[PDB]
C-alpha cells in the first residue's frame, strides 16, 4: 500500500498524506501521517463543532449581520444573505456544506471575538487533546502560507483523530453530534474526493479543503453497508508548481479508492 501511495505521488507530482485509524478489526493506514499539511477549509468542520459545543442549541437562532466588506474569500452562501444576515445555524450549514469562508470567519468571531477566533479554535482542538494542529489566520490568508510553514497546519493523524472524536466518540452530545454529522453528510463540495473512492452503498460524510500550492484535502467519516464506521483523512499539495500549482482532486479520489478497497475486502478462509 505504501508503494501504491508513492506511485500516486510520482504521477501527480504531489505530496500525499493519508490516515485511517485502526479499528478492532483493521490495522491503521498511515502514509506521511505525521507530516504537516495546511488545513485549508478542513478546519471549518471542527470549527462548527466548537461553536456547537460551547453554546445551547438556541444559539443557532442568533442572527449575525455582516457587510460586503467582510466577504474576502469564496462565500457562496454569505454573498446571497449579505443584506439580511445569517443565523449561527445557517453559518454552520454554509461553512460545512458550501465551504463558505465568510461563514467560517464569522464563526471564528463568534467563538473568540474579533481578535481571538483563531486562538480560540486552536484551543478547542487542545481541549480535545490535539497538541499538534494550529490555526493562525482567517480566510483567505490561511490558504497561503508557504510549504513548510507550520502555521495553519494539521496532520492526517491529528485531524482524523479529531474528526473521530466529534462524529464517532463522545466529544459532542448526541443532538449536537447529529447536526454536525448531517451537515457533513449533505456536503456539496466533495463529490470528486473521498466520496468518489467508496462504493455507493457506503455512507460518506466529509469536509474538503483547497488552497494555494496545489493544496487539496478531504476529511471523512464513512460507514460500511452494515454500519461499521471508519475515519479517512487525505491531504495533498503540489509545491513544485509554485503558488498557483493546480490542485488535483483525482489524486484524493485515487487515495480514497485504495483505502476503500482495503476496508471493504473480506478474508474468509477456505476449507483445506
Q: Domain extents for the chain?
A: 1-272
Alpha-carbon gap, residue 91 to 103, rounded angstroms: 5
Q: What SS3 class is residue 95?
A: helix
Alpha-carbon gap, residue 157 to 35, rounded angstroms: 9
Alpha-carbon gap, residue 117 to 259, rounded angstroms: 34
Q: What SS3 class is residue 238?
A: coil
Domain 1-272: give its CATH code: 3.40.710.10
Where on the phi/psi map is residue 89: left (φ > 0), alpha (ψ -120 to 50), or beta?
alpha
Where on the phi/psi map is residue 25: left (φ > 0), alpha (ψ -120 to 50), or beta?
alpha
Active site residue: 41, 75, 99, 133, which one?
41
Do 61 and 85 form a contact (C-beta atoms < 8 A)?
no
In this structure, what C-alpha cell is assigned to residue 158? 491529528
Beta-bridge mates of residue 223: 203, 229
Whether 236 sits among the annotated catalytic residues: the reply is no
Active site residue: 73, 75, 133, 139, which one?
139
Count the alpha carbons within 13 Å of 199 in the hemisphere toward its beta carbon. Answer: 8
What lies within 8 Å, CB to CB, of 268 at 6+ separation is: none
**Cα angle vertex 149, ends 218, 136, to 5°?**
75
Whether 41 sits among the annotated catalytic residues: the reply is yes
**Gyration radius of the chain over CA positions:** 18
Do 99 and 93 form a contact (C-beta atoms < 8 A)?
no
Report the length, in residues, of the chain. Answer: 272
Alpha-carbon gap, residue 243 to 126, rounded angstroms: 30
Do 142 and 136 form a contact (C-beta atoms < 8 A)?
yes
Q: Determine how many CB atoms are found less than 10 A away from the CB of residue 60.
A: 18
- By the 10 Å C-beta count (0-12 exposed, 13-18 middle, 19+ buried), 191 is classed as middle
In this structure, what C-alpha cell is assigned to residue 214? 496545489
In this structure, what C-alpha cell is assigned to residue 170? 463522545
What lies within 8 Å, CB to CB, of 25 at 6+ separation is: none
Q: What SS3 class is residue 237?
A: strand
Q: Solved how?
A: X-ray
Do 209 and 73 form a contact (C-beta atoms < 8 A)?
no
Alpha-carbon gap, residue 65 to 49, rounded angstroms: 21
Torsion sign, CA atoms 132, 8, 260, 250: positive
Do 193 and 234 form a contact (C-beta atoms < 8 A)?
yes
Cβ-count burial 151-171 (b if 16+ within 10 Å, e if not): bbbbbbbbbbbbbbbbbbeeb
Picking from 177, 174, 167, the residue whose alpha carbon sits closest to that of residue 203 is 167
Which residue, chain included where needed, has cell 463543532? 49
Given resolution (angstroms): 1.2
In this structure, what C-alpha cell is assigned to residue 17? 498524506
Q: Find the helix packing angle between 174-185 and 88-97, rounded to 10°.
A: 40
Which residue, chain included where needed, has cell 461499521? 228
Amino acid at each position: 500500500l505504501a508503494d501504491r501511495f508513492a506511485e500516486l505521488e510520482r504521477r501527480y507530482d504531489a505530496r500525499l498524506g493519508v490516515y485511517v485509524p485502526a479499528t478492532g478489526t483493521t490495522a491503521a493506514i498511515e502514509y506521511r501521517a505525521d507530516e504537516r499539511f495546511a488545513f485549508c477549509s478542513t478546519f471549518k468542520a471542527p470549527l462548527v463543532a466548537a461553536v456547537l459545543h460551547q453554546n445551547p442549541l438556541t444559539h443557532l437562532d442568533k442572527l449575525i449581520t455582516y457587510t460586503s466588506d467582510d466577504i474576502r474569500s469564496i462565500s457562496p452562501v454569505a454573498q446571497q444573505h449579505v443584506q439580511t444576515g445569517m443565523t449561527i445555524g445557517q453559518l454552520c450549514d454554509a461553512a460545512i456544506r458550501y465551504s463558505d469562508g465568510t461563514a467560517a470567519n464569522l464563526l471564528l468571531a463568534d467563538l473568540g471575538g474579533p481578535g481571538g477566533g483563531t486562538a480560540a479554535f486552536t484551543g478547542y482542538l487542545r481541549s480535545l487533546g490535539d497538541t499538534v494542529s494550529r490555526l493562525d489566520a482567517e480566510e483567505p490568508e490561511l490558504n497561503r502560507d508557504p510549504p513548510g510553514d507550520e502555521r495553519d497546519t494539521t496532520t492526517p493523524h491529528a485531524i482524523a483523530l479529531v474528526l473521530q472524536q466529534l462524529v464517532l466518540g463522545n466529544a459532542l452530545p448526541p443532538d449536537k453530534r447529529a447536526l454536525l454529522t448531517d451537515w457533513m453528510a449533505r456536503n456539496t463540495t466533495g463529490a470528486k474526493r473521498i466520496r468518489a473512492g467508496f462504493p455507493a452503498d457506503w455512507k460518506v460524510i466529509d469536509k474538503t479543503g483547497t488552497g494555494d500550492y496545489g493544496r487539496a484535502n478531504d476529511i471523512a467519516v464513512v460507514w460500511s453497508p452494515t454500519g461499521v464506521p471508519y475515519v479517512v483523512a487525505v491531504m495533498s499539495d503540489r509545491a513544485g508548481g509554485g503558488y498557483d500549482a493546480e490542485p488535483r482532486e483525482a489524486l484524493l479520489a485515487e487515495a480514497a479508492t485504495c483505502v476503500a478497497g482495503v476496508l471493504a475486502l473480506e478474508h474468509h478462509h477456505h476449507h483445506h
